[PDB]
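Notes continue from the previous slide.

Worked example: a multi-chain complex. Inputs as given:
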Amino acid sequence: SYCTLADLIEQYSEQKIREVSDRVNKPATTIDTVIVDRAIADADSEIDLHLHGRYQLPLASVPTALKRIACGLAYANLHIVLKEENPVYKTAEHLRKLLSGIANGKLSLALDADGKPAPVANTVQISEGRNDWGADW
Amino acid sequence: VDVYGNPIRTQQLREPQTSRLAGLAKEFAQHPAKGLTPAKLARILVEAEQGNLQAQAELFMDMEERDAHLFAEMSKRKRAILGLDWAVEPPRNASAAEKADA
C-alpha cells in the first residue's frame, strides 16, 4: 500500500475520483472503495515487478517518490478505456520510465522518512575466500 | 675473592640468587615473532638498546626456532666447538704447587 484513497484525493481532487470510481450511478454520487483499492493494488504490483531485483519487496516503509508513482499508476488504472494521447497515459508512461530507471541502477530509491531503504544483498555475494598463510602464524 | 676483586662471602653460596624470585620461573614467552613487520622489528631493536632485552631475547629464540637454515648453521658452528678436546694447564713456567693445583 504505497498510496491510499486520501492520497489519490489530495492529488487529483475528490470530484475526479468520484467520477472515475463510480460506474453504477450517473451522475456519480459516491466513491467506490473497492475499485480504488484494486487500482492501488495493481499499481503496487507493477512497482513490485519493477523493484524486486534491487530491494526487499515487503517494504516496511514507503519512499515519497514511490507514493507519487503509485498514485499516478492507480489513477491511470482507474480508467476503463485509455488512449495513447490521453495526458494521464503520458504521466503513467513517465512514471514507468522512472521505475525502469530505478530498476536499471540509473536512479536511486530515496529516504522513506529519515532512514534509507533496505537494499537487497545481491552484490554482497562472493566466495568464502581462501587466504591461509596470511593469518599471522 | 673473585678475579674481579669483589669481596666474596660464602654464606650466599648456599642458595641460588633467583630462588627468591619465584615469579621469574612461572613466566611464559610472549612470542613477538608472530605477525612481525619491519617497523615492529626496528622498534624491538631500539627498545632493546635502551635496556629492554626481554622482547629481543624472545624474538631471537623465535627466530632460531622458526628458521631451518639458521638453525642448521648455528648447530654446525656450536657442534664444531663441542668436539674439541680440552685440558687444564698451569701458569707459565709454573712450580710444583701450581702444577699440582692444575
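Summary box: Residues 77 and 83 of chain B are 11 Å apart (CA to CA). The helical segments of chain B are 22-25, 38-49, 53-66, 68-82, 96-101.
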